[PDB]
Design an enzyme around this catalytic site. Structure first.
Site, PDB file in Angstrom:
ATOM      1  CE  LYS B  78      29.214  44.860  16.106  1.00  0.00           C
ATOM      2  NZ  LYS B  78      28.075  43.982  16.223  1.00  0.00           N
ATOM      3  CE1 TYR B 454      20.368  49.865  14.562  1.00  0.00           C
ATOM      4  CE2 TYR B 454      20.750  51.991  13.470  1.00  0.00           C
ATOM      5  CZ  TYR B 454      20.811  50.409  13.671  1.00  0.00           C
ATOM      6  OH  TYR B 454      21.393  49.772  12.665  1.00  0.00           O
TER       7      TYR B 454
HETATM    8  N1  LIG Z   1      18.465  46.049  13.475  1.00  0.00           N
HETATM    9  C1  LIG Z   1      20.035  45.653  13.835  1.00  0.00           C
HETATM   10  C2  LIG Z   1      20.215  44.199  13.240  1.00  0.00           C
HETATM   11  C3  LIG Z   1      21.985  44.067  13.349  1.00  0.00           C
HETATM   12  C4  LIG Z   1      22.140  42.934  14.234  1.00  0.00           C
HETATM   13  N2  LIG Z   1      23.278  42.559  14.359  1.00  0.00           N
HETATM   14  C5  LIG Z   1      24.134  43.734  13.726  1.00  0.00           C
HETATM   15  C6  LIG Z   1      25.424  43.822  13.160  1.00  0.00           C
HETATM   16  C7  LIG Z   1      25.924  44.819  12.454  1.00  0.00           C
HETATM   17  C8  LIG Z   1      24.905  45.772  11.852  1.00  0.00           C
HETATM   18  C9  LIG Z   1      23.516  45.437  12.002  1.00  0.00           C
HETATM   19  C10 LIG Z   1      23.111  44.317  12.913  1.00  0.00           C
END
Ligand SMILES: NCCc1c[nH]c2ccccc12
Ligand SMILES: Cc1cc2nc3c(=O)[nH]c(=O)nc-3n(C[C@H](O)[C@H](O)[C@H](O)COP(=O)(O)OP(=O)(O)OC[C@H]3O[C@@H](n4cnc5c(N)ncnc54)[C@H](O)[C@@H]3O)c2cc1C
Ligand SMILES: Cc1cc2nc3c(=O)[nH]c(=O)nc-3n(C[C@H](O)[C@H](O)[C@H](O)COP(=O)(O)OP(=O)(O)OC[C@H]3O[C@@H](n4cnc5c(N)ncnc54)[C@H](O)[C@@H]3O)c2cc1C
Ligand SMILES: NCCc1c[nH]c2ccccc12
Lengths: 527, 528
Positions: B78, B454
């Site tokens: 993903k 990350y």
């Molecule tokens: N810090 C990651 C935040 C995030 C949560 N769900 C996501 C989906 C796509 C991109 C970032 C995110």
């Protein structure tokens, strides 16, 4: 309403010329900056101490390398604040009393505690200390610095290579004049000596112009108040209330001077000293050939004459003929630092006693935040509010931190030290203390990499008083947690492999003590 | 008095086995862990999207490398969530409608916006867009990902090297059994199949024992409630109120299934798709040879068969022979996650619709906070209260961010979409929206190095919804600042040298589109 065209800075001290340089650089070629500076009764150079991000957030932003500004400002090096006689009863003396079979001092250094298995070394130290497997004080266990500062070592080797994080000692006046030369000659900032007589506001409450005693009229879109304690714009004209915070901090006055010093007979100390007195505390800020010292005291427990005597007796000076600066302080902050089109920067904005070297930092922190929240002529209230919020927690967290130095001192020997303890901590401070007593870190940094920390202003701003500082001060004073972190009982291999980390600190202590030059030897070679 | 000796986890879904794994690994040899799980009717594997720190904060903690657990759980990759038809009226369809001479989609990627002169790229993009210097959408201007996702490209080259931040799609049941195998065979966690019949509390209200239908009694010092929406310990036994938060989120139901898919004819999409519907939205989570999908809808704007129909029509399914999961869930969180000696973890703790792939994150983020606040038998109240504070900020900040997907949608074409625009935002969210309109970044990350972000859970946790995510979503939906950032008019040299930053994206997005294999081609290489 379009972009900001003209800015007027009122005040020409350290705050004024830092504002001129920082704005002149950040807005170079897109705003006309004018600074009005009235002649003032000059003061002695009593020294200022700084923190590492003065180079990375301020002088680097201007494009000025460390060596260019140090050579003109006759600066020395600062590796720590050394806290002398905060745990023992007695008179105000430069010499450290004895406590637990050693001198009564502790250091607040600049390093960050290393993480071992996601946990700050402070927790492993307290673990051993609680279970009686060590009596070594917190700072000596976890930092290399204390051993080498006990020996007045330099933070740089003679080849220039850096072995510890450090900041600077200097006379603020010399920096202000270095910056005035820089802003006017390199950034187009225009200097006008004149004295503000009258501030003209419009029906929205914003400043329209200032009229000087000359009769000249200065208009501008944005006004920066650097008038110091007077607050000739934010307080006089805009009528913004000043929040007095003497329910958290009893110190409100100082006497200071500057003492010649023979650096070739005694060396130069690579640290600021904070010497506990009967009614306050005394700074010592080493510079070249001299040191600045000042007694910060509470007017409510010492008259100016007693403070002058205690201060002079301590350095064996003549209370009658010693050139002294006597000062009464505004302690607290404005209810809002930025109102209408008037931004306060410096002591016109806020002031707390310089127990942790924050004076200059408050100046360039605010300007960094000012540019980050920079407006246009529409003066969107959200920018003004956001800035105010940042300036407010920046100061209040410091107020809270500085208070803890007095609140948690075990001293009970003078009315001053007993009275400090009668104050209430702010709710946000009490909640941090509860965490500390429960064995958790307080504002532990995300990373333990000190370059990321001191090299990235937003990383350090968002976490300014981190777990390392809290331990330095709190453990130093003797406030320690009620019991070790409960995770450590579930980490039998972490608490054993941690010995090789303490032993690394000891190897650095021993090796740096044998190979580093003294700070004086290093300063001589530079020049 | 003394350390925690025995932990009992109630519930063995996905939350329970992560809790067993994580706690079993973090307390190895210093606590006995028993998981108690009942025979329930299982659900269809409707799929689950994740976020990159799943590897760095959870599997890496367990010592399980990414290749081992991926091959065993049939996981695909993903790179983003694709939002489809959030800006155009019409029926629920899988095909993007047309909007301003382009398809009505936008992406939320995992990258961080590069800084240029201390200012995020989003501020320069909006500068140009507002002065008419560009009409390119934000996501295509600032991220390399959209172009390569439009062509179902792989985030890894066939030799392995990683050209983007990415996470995973998988069937949660498979990850659960993988973790049940790991915890029982390598961490010593004892698995008991049985049903909870009676929870015995002591005089101070803490849990003393649970007794099962077979009459067995299990005692513990710390009880971890992973019983899902039932909340058999936290809500029913300990009586902790659930805080419903449907005054921020109208979606309370779902209908979901697993659809077979021809990967050889259509490839595999490297993204979750979030497809706007008449009374909610539909996820699509691609896996190997199939994809999970589910219609998340509001029970107050669509009856259960209005939804089954809209949902089966869009995927060309037969409402009467397609296996369908129908759930009505509770939305919100417990007043306190941890109470007494009982810690809720997973949907026993909180739940928000999976619009942003948070459900599994909530499990291991809470497990992380639990170990960091780990107590002893005296249950220091400060450890519990800091834990409960971290859990509720985690959740509330997500609740706000999700509400904003519906609140700033321009659609006005069904009772549902018009009803979203009449809810209140929480004051904190309202404040961020004011900052955004004023040209400001919102929770801008301290650094723009994505590895430091990350890879450091504390870093990401303190900054979870960063400025990149807010721009992806709000700018995607067409909410944009009132005017450009006031600093940009003062930085002539910055706004001219930024053209080389946008060009670097254009080059990297042109070059990857020619050099990257399809995800499908990459997927076939790993599995045999
Ligand atoms: N810090 C990651 C935040 C995030 C949560 N769900 C996501 C989906 C796509 C991109 C970032 C995110
Ligand atoms: C006595 C004292 C000691 C300190 N010691 C330390 C220390 O040891 N360590 C540390 O870190 N910090 C210290 N600080 C904090 C220190 O002042 C910082 O350097 C601070 O940033 C300086 O701010 P400032 O220039 O606003 O203060 P001030 O020096 O009060 O500024 C006064 C300036 O206002 C201008 N002005 C006023 N009225 C008018 C007018 N009508 N027209 C034109 N101009 C006007 C004058 O030009 C004057 O120079 C100390 C501050 C004081 C006052
Ligand atoms: C519809 C849906 C869609 C989702 N989509 C996504 C997504 O796209 N992305 C993402 O990251 N996350 C998603 N999630 C995340 C979801 O929150 C996780 O799957 C969650 O962590 C697992 O739920 P749970 O294990 O907490 O509850 P459940 O799986 O319901 O746990 C039930 C378990 O509780 C135990 N139990 C219950 N009662 C008793 C009893 N009386 N006695 C003994 N044992 C008992 C049983 O063992 C049972 O196995 C989704 C979740 C749902 C429901
Ligand atoms: N993050 C900088 C905190 C600090 C302020 N004053 C200090 C003095 C010594 C050590 C750290 C500090």
């Amino acid at each position: 309403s379009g972009k900001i065209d003209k800015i007027l800075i009122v005040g020409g001290g350290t705050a004024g010329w830092m504002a001129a340089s920082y704005l002149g650089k950040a807005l170079q070629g897109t705003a006309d900056i004018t600074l009005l500076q009235a002649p003032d009764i000059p003061t002695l150079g009593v020294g200022e101490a700084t923190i590492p991000n003065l180079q990375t957030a301020f002088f680097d932003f201007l494009g000025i390398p460390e060596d260019e500004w140090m050579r003109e400002c006759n600066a020395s090096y600062k590796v720590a604040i050394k806290f002398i006689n905060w745990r023992t009863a007695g008179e105000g003396t430069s010499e450290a009393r004895e406590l637990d079979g050693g001198p009564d001092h502790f250091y607040h250094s600049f390093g960050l505690l290393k993480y071992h298995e996601q946990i700050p070394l402070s927790h492993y130290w307290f673990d051993r200390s609680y279970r009686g497997k060590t009596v070594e004080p917190f700072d000596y266990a976890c930092y290399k610095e204390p051993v080498i500062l006990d020996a007045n070592r330099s933070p740089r080797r003679l080849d220039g290579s850096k072995v510890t994080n450090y900041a600077w000692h200097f006379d603020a006046h010399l920096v202000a004049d270095f910056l005035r030369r820089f802003a006017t000659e390199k950034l187009g900032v225009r200097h006008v000596e004149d004295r503000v007589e009258h501030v003209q506001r419009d029906a929205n409450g914003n400043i329209e112009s200032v009229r000087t005693a000359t009769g000249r009229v200065f208009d501008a879109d944005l006004f920066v108040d650097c008038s110091g304690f007077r607050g000739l714009l934010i307080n006089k004209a805009m009528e913004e209330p000043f929040l007095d915070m003497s329910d958290h901090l009893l110190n409100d006055s100082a006497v200071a001077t500057q003492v010649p010093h023979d650096d070739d007979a005694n060396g130069v100390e690579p640290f600021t000293s904070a010497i506990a007195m009967k009614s306050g505390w005394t700074w010592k800020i080493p510079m070249l050939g001299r040191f600045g010292t000042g007694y910060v005291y509470s007017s409510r427990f010492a008259t100016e004459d007693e403070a002058v005597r205690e201060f002079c007796e301590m350095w064996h000076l003549d209370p009658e003929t010693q050139p002294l600066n006597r000062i009464r302080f505004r302690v607290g902050r404005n209810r809002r630092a930025w109102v209408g089109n008037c931004v306060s920067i410096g002591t016109s904005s806020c002031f707390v006693e310089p127990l942790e070297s924050t004076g200059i930092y408050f100046v360039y922190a605010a300007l960094y935040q000012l540019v980050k929240h920079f407006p246009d002529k529409s003066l969107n209230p959200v920018l003004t509010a956001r800035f105010n919020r940042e300036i407010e927690t920046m100061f209040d967290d410091t107020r809270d931190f500085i208070q803890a130095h007095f609140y948690f001192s075990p001293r009970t020997d003078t009315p001053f030290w007993r009275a400090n303890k009668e104050l209430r901590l702010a709710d946000g401070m009490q909640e941090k203390i509860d965490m500390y007593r429960a064995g958790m870190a307080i504002n532990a940094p995300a990373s333990d990499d000190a370059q990321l920390y001191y090299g990235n202003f937003e990383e350090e701003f968002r976490n300014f008083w981190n777990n390392s500082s809290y331990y330095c001060v709190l453990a130093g004073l003797g406030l320690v947690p009620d019991a070790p972190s409960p995770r450590l009982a579930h980490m039998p291999q972490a608490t054993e492999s941690v010995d090789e980390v303490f032993g690394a600190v000891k190897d650095r202590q021993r090796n740096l003590l044998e190979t580093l030059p003294s700070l004086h030897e290093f300063l001589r070679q530079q020049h």
